[PDB]
Amino acid sequence: LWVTVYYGVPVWKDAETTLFCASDAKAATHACVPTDPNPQEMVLENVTENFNMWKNDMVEQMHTDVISLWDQSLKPCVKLTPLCVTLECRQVNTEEIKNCSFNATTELRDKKQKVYALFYRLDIVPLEEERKGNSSKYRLINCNTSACTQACPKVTFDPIPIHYCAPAGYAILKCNNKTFNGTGPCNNVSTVQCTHGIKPVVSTQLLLNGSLAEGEIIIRSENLTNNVKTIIVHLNESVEIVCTRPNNYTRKSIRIGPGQTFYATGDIIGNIRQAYCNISKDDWIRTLQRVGKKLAEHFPRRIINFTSPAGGDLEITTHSFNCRGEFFYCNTSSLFNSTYNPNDSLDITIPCRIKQIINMWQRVGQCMYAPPIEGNITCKSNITGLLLVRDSNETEIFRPGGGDMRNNWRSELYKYKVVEIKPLGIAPTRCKRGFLGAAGSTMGAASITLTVQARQLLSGILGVWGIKQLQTRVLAIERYLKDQQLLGIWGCSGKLICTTAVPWNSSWSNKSHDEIWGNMTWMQWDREIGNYTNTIYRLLEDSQNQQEQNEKDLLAC
Amino acid sequence: LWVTVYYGVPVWKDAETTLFCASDAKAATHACVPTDPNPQEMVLENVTENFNMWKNDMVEQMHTDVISLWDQSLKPCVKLTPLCVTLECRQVNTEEIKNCSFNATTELRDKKQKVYALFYRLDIVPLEEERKGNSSKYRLINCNTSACTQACPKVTFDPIPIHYCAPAGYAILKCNNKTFNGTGPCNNVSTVQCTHGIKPVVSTQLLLNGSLAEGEIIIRSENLTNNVKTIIVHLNESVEIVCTRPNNYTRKSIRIGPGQTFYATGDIIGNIRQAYCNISKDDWIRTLQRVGKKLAEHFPRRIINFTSPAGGDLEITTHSFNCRGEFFYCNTSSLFNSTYNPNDSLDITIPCRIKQIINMWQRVGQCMYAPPIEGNITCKSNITGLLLVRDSNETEIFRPGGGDMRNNWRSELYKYKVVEIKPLGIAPTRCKRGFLGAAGSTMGAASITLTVQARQLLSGILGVWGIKQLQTRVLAIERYLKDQQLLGIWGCSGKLICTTAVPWNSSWSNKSHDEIWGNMTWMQWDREIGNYTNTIYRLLEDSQNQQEQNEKDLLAC
Ligand SMILES: *[C@@H]1O[C@H](CO)[C@@H](O[C@@H]2O[C@H](CO)[C@@H](O[C@@H]3O[C@H](CO[C@H]4O[C@H](CO)[C@@H](O)[C@H](O)[C@@H]4O)[C@@H](O)[C@H](O[C@H]4O[C@H](CO)[C@@H](O)[C@H](O)[C@@H]4O)[C@@H]3O)[C@H](O)[C@H]2NC(C)=O)[C@H](O)[C@H]1NC(C)=O
Ligand SMILES: *[C@@H]1O[C@H](CO)[C@@H](O[C@@H]2O[C@H](CO)[C@@H](O[C@@H]3O[C@H](CO[C@H]4O[C@H](CO)[C@@H](O)[C@H](O)[C@@H]4O)[C@@H](O)[C@H](O[C@H]4O[C@H](CO)[C@@H](O)[C@H](O)[C@@H]4O)[C@@H]3O)[C@H](O)[C@H]2NC(C)=O)[C@H](O)[C@H]1NC(C)=O
Ligand SMILES: *[C@@H]1O[C@H](CO)[C@@H](O[C@@H]2O[C@H](CO)[C@@H](O[C@@H]3O[C@H](CO)[C@@H](O)[C@H](O)[C@@H]3O)[C@H](O)[C@H]2NC(C)=O)[C@H](O)[C@H]1NC(C)=O
Ligand SMILES: *[C@@H]1O[C@H](CO)[C@@H](O[C@@H]2O[C@H](CO)[C@@H](O[C@@H]3O[C@H](CO)[C@@H](O)[C@H](O)[C@@H]3O)[C@H](O)[C@H]2NC(C)=O)[C@H](O)[C@H]1NC(C)=O
Ligand SMILES: *[C@@H]1O[C@H](CO)[C@@H](O[C@@H]2O[C@H](CO)[C@@H](O)[C@H](O)[C@H]2NC(C)=O)[C@H](O)[C@H]1NC(C)=O
Ligand SMILES: *[C@@H]1O[C@H](CO)[C@@H](O[C@@H]2O[C@H](CO)[C@@H](O)[C@H](O)[C@H]2NC(C)=O)[C@H](O)[C@H]1NC(C)=O
Ligand SMILES: *[C@@H]1O[C@H](CO)[C@@H](O[C@@H]2O[C@H](CO)[C@@H](O)[C@H](O)[C@H]2NC(C)=O)[C@H](O)[C@H]1NC(C)=O
Ligand SMILES: *[C@@H]1O[C@H](CO)[C@@H](O[C@@H]2O[C@H](CO)[C@@H](O)[C@H](O)[C@H]2NC(C)=O)[C@H](O)[C@H]1NC(C)=O
Ligand SMILES: *[C@@H]1O[C@H](CO)[C@@H](O[C@@H]2O[C@H](CO)[C@@H](O)[C@H](O)[C@H]2NC(C)=O)[C@H](O)[C@H]1NC(C)=O
Ligand SMILES: *[C@@H]1O[C@H](CO)[C@@H](O[C@@H]2O[C@H](CO)[C@@H](O)[C@H](O)[C@H]2NC(C)=O)[C@H](O)[C@H]1NC(C)=O
Ligand SMILES: *[C@@H]1O[C@H](CO)[C@@H](O[C@@H]2O[C@H](CO)[C@@H](O)[C@H](O)[C@H]2NC(C)=O)[C@H](O)[C@H]1NC(C)=O
Ligand SMILES: *[C@@H]1O[C@H](CO)[C@@H](O[C@@H]2O[C@H](CO)[C@@H](O)[C@H](O)[C@H]2NC(C)=O)[C@H](O)[C@H]1NC(C)=O
Ligand SMILES: *[C@@H]1O[C@H](CO)[C@@H](O[C@@H]2O[C@H](CO)[C@@H](O)[C@H](O)[C@H]2NC(C)=O)[C@H](O)[C@H]1NC(C)=O
Ligand SMILES: *[C@@H]1O[C@H](CO)[C@@H](O[C@@H]2O[C@H](CO)[C@@H](O)[C@H](O)[C@H]2NC(C)=O)[C@H](O)[C@H]1NC(C)=O
Ligand SMILES: *[C@@H]1O[C@H](CO)[C@@H](O[C@@H]2O[C@H](CO)[C@@H](O)[C@H](O)[C@H]2NC(C)=O)[C@H](O)[C@H]1NC(C)=O
Ligand SMILES: *[C@@H]1O[C@H](CO)[C@@H](O)[C@H](O)[C@H]1NC(C)=O
Ligand SMILES: *[C@@H]1O[C@H](CO)[C@@H](O)[C@H](O)[C@H]1NC(C)=O
Ligand SMILES: *[C@@H]1O[C@H](CO)[C@@H](O)[C@H](O)[C@H]1NC(C)=O
Ligand SMILES: *[C@@H]1O[C@H](CO)[C@@H](O)[C@H](O)[C@H]1NC(C)=O
Ligand SMILES: *[C@@H]1O[C@H](CO)[C@@H](O)[C@H](O)[C@H]1NC(C)=O
Ligand SMILES: *[C@@H]1O[C@H](CO)[C@@H](O)[C@H](O)[C@H]1NC(C)=O
Ligand SMILES: *[C@@H]1O[C@H](CO)[C@@H](O)[C@H](O)[C@H]1NC(C)=O
Ligand SMILES: *[C@@H]1O[C@H](CO)[C@@H](O)[C@H](O)[C@H]1NC(C)=O
Ligand SMILES: *[C@@H]1O[C@H](CO)[C@@H](O)[C@H](O)[C@H]1NC(C)=O
């Protein structure tokens, strides 16, 4: 037999690459392309692939892009250096809100003004002074760390969905195997150009506004026997939650410099009220009993205890939640107060704390200040999942947890993998001299299909964001040219099928013509002879396509 | 008949693209290429094209580039934050100049010094104090808005001409139709690689140092019956204007911080004099009577009144003018003080105001401070055009106007349009299987010419400015490769003329062989069969160049 060169071979390799950031065509948006994701999903019949949501670079890539766009939005905003002064505070007489006085900087640098603003106790750090009941002195939290930046008017906290799209030459494989646990084989896969839109919703403990499971509740973890891993629970039903801050604050504007202002909380309209969340009781209870049972399947002969918060540090103990730019730290200890034993009105009130100083993304010194928001601050959302951490007592104790934002994205991106298409390949023949739809079928069947299908590959012919696009285009060109070049030197113009003068080595494969062509798919073949790739290429370029020209044409002198 | 593929077809599409910024080869200059514009203008005989100066992206592109380079020049300069202090001012006893005292910051931050500087009243804002005749207190204008930046020594105010040059694959079409009014057809066009140099001269009301009209005075507007549009008047003769500031100021240098100084006005040498402009009276009068008549042609049976300034706000009421970095706001109400009635020494003195705080480009907060300039501040220039705004009384009342800098560039760029060359095309033949100079002629004539001319297309084979160049090169490569690729798959190597096996459809065109080849130009043809482009390409790539290989070569097994 003889080596035949094929172009358009439906095989791929796992590969990492920068994906395009696509936005909403109807539209932190200037960086992304507002196009149609065109989710022309194709199912690959009879194809099984290995997915691993814990090693998915799309998650890491998203983490970086979410942070980067978020940071750009604060770039032109005011650094509140003038507020890192002694604050004289008194109790508001209109127990978490204090009335503080400052000597602020005026438009003129040689003048100061005495101004006041209201603050939440959580954002204020006492100096070496005690509560006297009338007055005491304070520092703003983080004045010993960073010049915290005020969010600008029109900074958007709208979790506008992001779509990731493959560069030409790459494809995104989606796992449709309902109940797939995030690792191992998926026996139902399909390919897309783009992912569904993912809303970069930021939270801890309770995952909000995501995609619900198609089947039953699925519990996923990198390692279920590792008590240091986060367990992601995907609900198949949403639970209604609505949060509100019913205390009518007024926004004041204080000049703190030559062309800049600070937005201060003040003039509380009459009543003092605690912020809270409204959670349906029957749905919460049903949800945990159902989660309990699924956990029991993973942890049999154990009592399940969804009974404890983290321990007391607000940053990790409460539910980090955003509402229209407002920041809530809600106490969920009343939700996670139950057990499960497999063989044994009507709402829930969650009190919430409000804080204006935000250590976003767990970074230190990258501080944002949230200005007060006037009006009806109420947000209604869907709990779609849980982040649980498993803790001797023949009991599996669980606590809600989080803070690693990657888990909020693994929870959506677990369905996707990125691979690189590798159109060249070889196989023996007896003759001497929608792209991946032909996958899961034998090489023979594909070779017929590819006489047409191979041409679908021809469809592939802001600061750092400008660079990401340039690298993407340059790489696409580079790979294209390398393949064109190899085909050129091998004498394979008319590349879909190219017979050559290189003989087949039984040492590469000793399978018969029909054993190979009718009992293997192209990927199986690629693996079986994969380490002879360089050998074959040398035989084709250094010998046969040189000898076949020199011994025929130079003789024509 | 049969479809024949042609390469080098002289057709084009209107297209937007980033143009190269070219500079003066003899030379805000580091960003542009100091090359030879090589204005090898070619006239296209018998070609009519549609131009629209009001929709010209070159104007918008220039606006951005002028601003961007101007801003880079101030990037390393000192922000005068130390001067936003209370100013104690007294009348200068050497009525617009005040003597002001400051407590300036010394090299050491713990010391202040009492210093003084002179200021123009226009740059000073009173505090809550009255004139007493001896002293009062002030703020510098814009200390409530922005930390105005001092122009550095060696910031250049030299309106160095810019040339725009087309990327390979693009051409710039120039309209040579004298009296063309900016819209509609131009019956005399030519192509260039580069535009003439355009000096980015900034002014309002009177356009200075531009290109004079070849013929008579031309009046252009997006809409002459719209009283909200600016009317651009292009003179065919220049009017001499010279402006001067004869008051001998001395430059003082005040340290205002650790490594930075402020340049202060002071020590007036003896005399106080008002700045002014010198305008020839006979030329001004002749110019307006001539403009009046041309306006009467557009607005017949009306009295024309060139009689009024904007109304009193210095920023829009006066003539914004620059002289060696100095900023003048001259009162032109004495120029625009006349009428016209179609059937009915020796100079003009224009008093001028001088201002050091500049809100360049109508932006707010992007403030520049102009340091005092010592010596003979006199500039002689050419008025080359007017920006007029038309205001019931059977009179057309005109006022000088401006502030939208784009109009200062539309006035030069009205002659140019950018188009993209599209070298591939098809036409029927009877056979089955300087680039645009051949334009305006029939396809037949061009097809002979193109056997040579098509090869001229082969000649096409700093921060953001680095990106503009990279995008330009990458795109040129991308387009090149796409065309090479299509020709490859269609079997059209030797691309200038390529017969194919695809039959001609009478449904695309039912014109005869000679009706098509001898009575149409290539652009006319491209329009007539333009929507069949994808149809033809599919027939060529999916069918004929696949079938023609498989049915001939695979049989050779
Ligand atoms: C899970 O998903 C839900 C649903 O999207 C989120 O809840 C929504 O959150 C958005 C904010 O991100 C809320 O939008 C705000 O609504 C205010 C009320 O709108 C009134 O007027 C509209 C007019 O058509 C009516 O339809 C509506 O019923 C009300 O009558 C607006 O005033 C807000 O405007 C602000 O932003 C715009 C943006 O351009 C500015 O121009 C405005 O000046 C102003 O700043 C804003 O539109 C939305 O109402 C919420 N819906 C619900 C049901 O709560 C959840 O928050 C999300 N979960 C999480 C955790 O985010
Ligand atoms: C319309 O077009 C006219 C013509 O170009 C412009 O008027 C000219 O504007 C430029 C400034 O942009 C003026 O240039 C300045 O001239 C000063 C006088 O030069 C003397 O020495 C030269 C030596 O050969 C003699 O030729 C000349 O007659 C004088 O004897 C210079 O001192 C200035 O130098 C400054 O810039 C250089 C740049 O490197 C620095 O090195 C110097 O230290 C210094 O900073 C400068 O050269 C020019 O004189 C003007 N000509 C006239 C006739 O006015 C108009 O301004 C323009 N219209 C508008 C609106 O801009
Ligand atoms: C989400 O996942 C949960 C968990 O699998 C699904 O719960 C299942 O709900 C059905 C009823 O709709 C339960 O069937 C009935 O349960 C009662 C309980 O006493 C029993 O008496 C009946 O004979 C019958 O079994 C089913 O058991 C229950 N599964 C579990 C494990 O509890 C839920 O339906 C899913 N929701 C969606 C939208 O798919
Ligand atoms: C710039 O455009 C103006 C406007 O078209 C041109 O003005 C024209 O100038 C010529 C003289 O050079 C005028 O011709 C003579 O005018 C006198 C006026 O009383 C008349 O008596 C003569 O019989 C003769 O017509 C011509 O009329 C005038 N046009 C208009 C509309 O007034 C000017 O010449 C142009 N300049 C250049 C450099 O081309
Ligand atoms: C926060 O404190 C300020 C002052 O520390 C309170 O404002 C004053 O209220 C008194 C009441 O008669 C007025 O007479 C003063 O003119 C107010 N202004 C100032 C600057 O003293 C303010 O009401 C307190 N805020 C709340 C919400 O209680
Ligand atoms: C996800 O499901 C896979 C498949 O059942 C689990 O992996 C198997 O774990 C058993 C445990 O002894 C092994 O014997 C199998 O060989 C494993 N198969 C594969 C393909 O890995 C995997 O552990 C599950 N993951 C989670 C988080 O539950
Ligand atoms: C394998 O995955 C494919 C894709 O999700 C499933 O196909 C869907 O089946 C539902 C059933 O009614 C259809 O409504 C969808 O339109 C189908 N999607 C597509 C893209 O065709 C398929 O059923 C899955 N097979 C199994 C066994 O789960
Ligand atoms: C989950 O991880 C834990 C450790 O992080 C694995 O259990 C331990 O693995 C080490 C590896 O050498 C052994 O020495 C320990 O004895 C193991 N612990 C126990 C209790 O046996 C655990 O096997 C991992 N689980 C899965 C499903 O991979
Ligand atoms: C959810 O919100 C509703 C109102 O929006 C709260 O309803 C109030 O509950 C108190 C409790 O005694 C009643 O006295 C009020 O009359 C109720 N309001 C109305 C309009 O009837 C409800 O309590 C909230 N739930 C939670 C969990 O806090
Ligand atoms: C601007 O004011 C300064 C002072 O306010 C004047 O300078 C002073 O002139 C008197 C005249 O005898 C001197 O004795 C002082 O030594 C000068 N310097 C200072 C710092 O007081 C200055 O002349 C005024 N400028 C103009 C142009 O009149
Ligand atoms: C620069 O600082 C000096 C500080 O001594 C200012 O002068 C004092 O201003 C206060 C204002 O009430 C007066 O009571 C003092 O009598 C002044 N002292 C002297 C010696 O004059 C001075 O005015 C500041 N400069 C400016 C321009 O404000
Ligand atoms: C520029 O000249 C063109 C050509 O004469 C003017 O456009 C014509 O306006 C008349 C007005 O009724 C129309 O009937 C013609 O059909 C128009 N022709 C074209 C080609 O547009 C155009 O209005 C003039 N523009 C200005 C600013 O005067
Ligand atoms: C059409 O435009 C061309 C280009 O401007 C004109 O050609 C110019 O004619 C003058 C007349 O003496 C020559 O001096 C120039 O050298 C010619 N330029 C070029 C590039 O050849 C042509 O005359 C115009 N035709 C009309 C009717 O206006
Ligand atoms: C210039 O623009 C004006 C409006 O900006 C045009 O005149 C008006 O066009 C609207 C369009 O529906 C009509 O409803 C008005 O009745 C028109 N006004 C008058 C007085 O008729 C005007 O036609 C435009 N001129 C040109 C030359 O395009
Ligand atoms: C243009 O500049 C010249 C000088 O450069 C000015 O001429 C002076 O005009 C006044 C007016 O009475 C005469 O007294 C002077 O004698 C003139 N100077 C000379 C040297 O003779 C002329 O006025 C300026 N024109 C304008 C419009 O201001
Ligand atoms: C459930 O079965 C397990 C089996 O080991 C047993 O230990 C546990 O006590 C049982 N629970 C009940 C409620 O019977
Ligand atoms: C705050 O009080 C004002 C008083 O008139 C009222 O109009 C406004 O609706 C209140 N806002 C909220 C959020 O209750
Ligand atoms: C806020 O919106 C909810 C939505 O129904 C409404 O019931 C509540 O009264 C609103 N509060 C204010 C202050 O308008
Ligand atoms: C197969 O590989 C062996 C390795 O030494 C080589 O000697 C032999 O000639 C090869 N045969 C073919 C068909 O290339
Ligand atoms: C390529 O090398 C790997 C190394 O483990 C081996 O497992 C695989 O079978 C080799 N393939 C071929 C074609 O020799
Ligand atoms: C010029 O002709 C117009 C025509 O309507 C007329 O109204 C106007 O009064 C005339 N002007 C003179 C000076 O005769
Ligand atoms: C300013 O006065 C000095 C005094 O000698 C003189 O030399 C200089 O030329 C004058 N400058 C101007 C612009 O008049
Ligand atoms: C012309 O187009 C029609 C459209 O249906 C098609 O049926 C016919 O075969 C075409 N003819 C040629 C020459 O391609
Ligand atoms: C292409 O579509 C446009 C749509 O208006 C039509 O006017 C034009 O004639 C069409 N050209 C062809 C070749 O059908």
List the SSEs and their pairings:
This is part of a larger assembly, with 2 copies of chain A (557 residues).
Chain A: E1 2-7, E2 12-14, E3 20-22, E4 42-44, E5 49-52, H1 57-74, E6 87-91, E7 97-105, E8 112-120, E9 124-126, E10 135-140, E11 149-150, E12 163-165, E13 170-175, E14 183-186, E15 189-192, E16 206-208, E17 218-220, E18 230-244, E19 250-257, E20 260-266, E21 275-280, H2 281-298, E22 303-306, H3 314-317, E23 319-323, E24 326-330, E25 338-340, E26 347-354, E27 357-358, E28 368-369, E29 378-390, E30 395-400, H4 407-413, E31 416-421, E32 424-429, H5 443-453, H6 464-489, E33 497-503, H7 513-517, H8 522-528, H9 533-553
Parallel strand pairs in A: 11-28, 22-30
Antiparallel strand pairs in A: 1-32, 1-33, 2-31, 3-12, 4-15, 5-14, 6-7, 6-10, 7-8, 9-10, 13-15, 13-31, 16-29, 17-18, 18-21, 18-29, 19-20, 21-26, 22-25, 23-24, 24-26, 27-28, 29-30
TL;DR?
The PDB classes it as viral protein/immune system. The structure is cut from a larger assembly and holds two copies of chain A (557 residues). Chain A has nine helices and 33 strands.
Give me some keywords for this one.
part of a larger assembly; 2 chains; 557 residues; alpha+beta; eleven-stranded mixed beta sheet; five-stranded antiparallel beta sheet; 21% helix; 32% strand; binds a molecule of 5 linked components (NAG-NAG-BMA-MAN-MAN); binds a molecule of 2 linked components (NAG-NAG); binds 2-acetamido-2-deoxy-beta-D-glucopyranose
